[PDB]
Design brief:
With about 400 residues, the protein is an alpha+beta fold. It has one domain. It is built from twelve helices and 17 strands. The strands form five sheets. Strands 5-7-6-8-10-9 form a six-stranded antiparallel beta sheet. A four-stranded antiparallel beta sheet has the order 3-2-1-4. A three-stranded antiparallel beta sheet has the order 13-14-15. Helix 9 crosses helix 11. The chain is globular, with a radius of gyration of 22 Å. The termini are far apart. Bound molecules: chloride ion (CL). The site of chloride ion (CL) has 4 residues, from strand 17. Pfam families: Couple_hipA, HipA_C. This is Serine/threonine-protein kinase toxin HipA.
Length: about 400
């Protein structure tokens, strides 16, 4: 059938699934007529006819969790017609990443339901074992609306405000909380987050940057954005560079066209050094996104889904020398990927071939060189008393070891 695509009460167009299985999208005339029109994706440019490219299927598929196990749970929950994407979005497409609201064609203000601690625990635990929310991730996360100090279920098409993550890596909630705090302390653009507790559940609540309250707090708006697989028209299956996905060079080139090119290229390169320092090995293409602005211009969103592989070291069998960056750097004979083998020279060499000013690359390295020690100390003040000590020890010790390569040079 057809899923009507809305962006904050404005009709954008309709998604169709053909009898032959193909997915097509058509923009609404009224959307195309606006002087402030913007495409749903840079892979789906504004145009009048039916769009039938694989970019249509890929774009909407990328709104859903990557995991087949998670999709099975979704079908079971809402009695979805099938496992196919169009049918999943027919059930949970009301509140998605970005501003796309999908509502069945056979269907015709701000309100919410406050959750008691008991009902919150109930709602959240239900995920490990008016609620049509879809979240893009690797595990099974959901979303809720925060009103003051209470967690709530939005009614109708009222949006959510926070992405909620449960433990994966049994300490992933604590791991990400720590990494988000550290990134913020070092000047990176990342969302604020908090550890929430509902009875026996411990989850991470991350503020959404694809949502914005108006000044009077009477309307909560959704903000359009898409991830790198979506912008390049790619399936989530190629999110890693080794599978054909975009790496540093492709993304840096794309950012030359951002409405904030200078700042975004600098922030993206700074984030590569940060990931190296904290041992983040899952910085694939879906971990980066851009806001789509009026007319189709774009700029990088904050970074997110940040987790260190350091707390997983030793434990089973993973060794420090086994940790690799998802997006490799330039090396004299190819690429440099091992965190334990990377030095300032690799970042400078990468900057050189990508036309990123050497003075800017030096500034980034020198800033981490003098700020890291104090930043690791400052984060402690924001950790609860029940925060796992092994996570702090693992990350701190390894960050300091690599930081030594920066301080010696700067
Ligand atoms: Cl290497």
């Amino acid at each position: 059938p057809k899923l009507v695509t809305w962006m904050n009460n404005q009709r954008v167009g309709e998604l169709t699934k053909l009898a032959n299985g193909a997915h097509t999208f058509k923009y609404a005339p009224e959307w195309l007529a606006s002087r402030y029109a913007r495409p749903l994706s840079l892979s789906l440019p504004l145009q009048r006819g039916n769009i039938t490219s694989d970019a249509v299927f890929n774009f909407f598929d990328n709104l859903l969790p990557d995991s087949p196990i998670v999709r099975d749970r979704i079908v079971k929950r809402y009695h979805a017609k099938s496992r196919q994407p169009f049918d999943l979005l027919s059930e949970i497409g009301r509140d998605s990443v970005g501003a796309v609201t999908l509502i069945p064609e056979d269907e015709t203000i701000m309100a919410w339901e406050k959750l008691t601690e008991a009902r919150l625990e109930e709602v959240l635990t239900a995920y490990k074992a008016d609620f049509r929310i879809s979240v893009a991730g690797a595990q099974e996360k959901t979303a809720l609306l925060r009103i003051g100090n209470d967690w709530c279920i939005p009614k109708g098409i009222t949006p959510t405000t926070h992405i909620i993550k449960l433990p994966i890596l049994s300490q992933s909630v604590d791991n990400e909380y720590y990494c988000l705090l550290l990134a913020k302390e070092l000047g990176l653009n990342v969302p604020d987050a908090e550890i929430i507790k509902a009875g026996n559940v411990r989850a991470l609540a991350v503020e959404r940057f694809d949502r914005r309250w108006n000044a009077e707090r009477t309307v909560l708006l959704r903000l359009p954005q898409e991830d790198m697989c979506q912008t390049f028209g790619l399936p989530s299956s190629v999110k890693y560079e080794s599978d054909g996905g975009p790496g540093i060079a492709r993304i840096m080139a794309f950012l030359m066209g951002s409405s904030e090119a200078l700042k975004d290229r600098y922030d993206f390169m700074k984030f590569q050094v940060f990931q190296w320092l904290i041992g983040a090995t899952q910085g694939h293409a879906k971990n980066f996104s851009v806001f789509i602005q009026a007319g189709g211009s774009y700029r990088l969103t904050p970074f997110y889904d940040i987790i260190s592989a350091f707390p997983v070291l030793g434990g089973t069998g993973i060794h420090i020398s086994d940790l690799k960056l998802a997006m490799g750097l330039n090396a004299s004979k190819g690429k440099k990927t091992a965190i334990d083998k990377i030095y300032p020279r690799h970042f400078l060499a990468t900057a050189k071939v990508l036309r990123f000013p050497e003075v800017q690359m030096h500034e980034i390295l020198s800033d981490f060189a003098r700020m890291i020690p104090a930043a690791l100390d400052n984060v402690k003040t924001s950790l609860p008393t029940d925060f796992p000590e092994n996570v702090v020890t693992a990350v701190e010790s390894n960050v300091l070891r690599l930081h030594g390569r920066l301080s010696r040079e700067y």
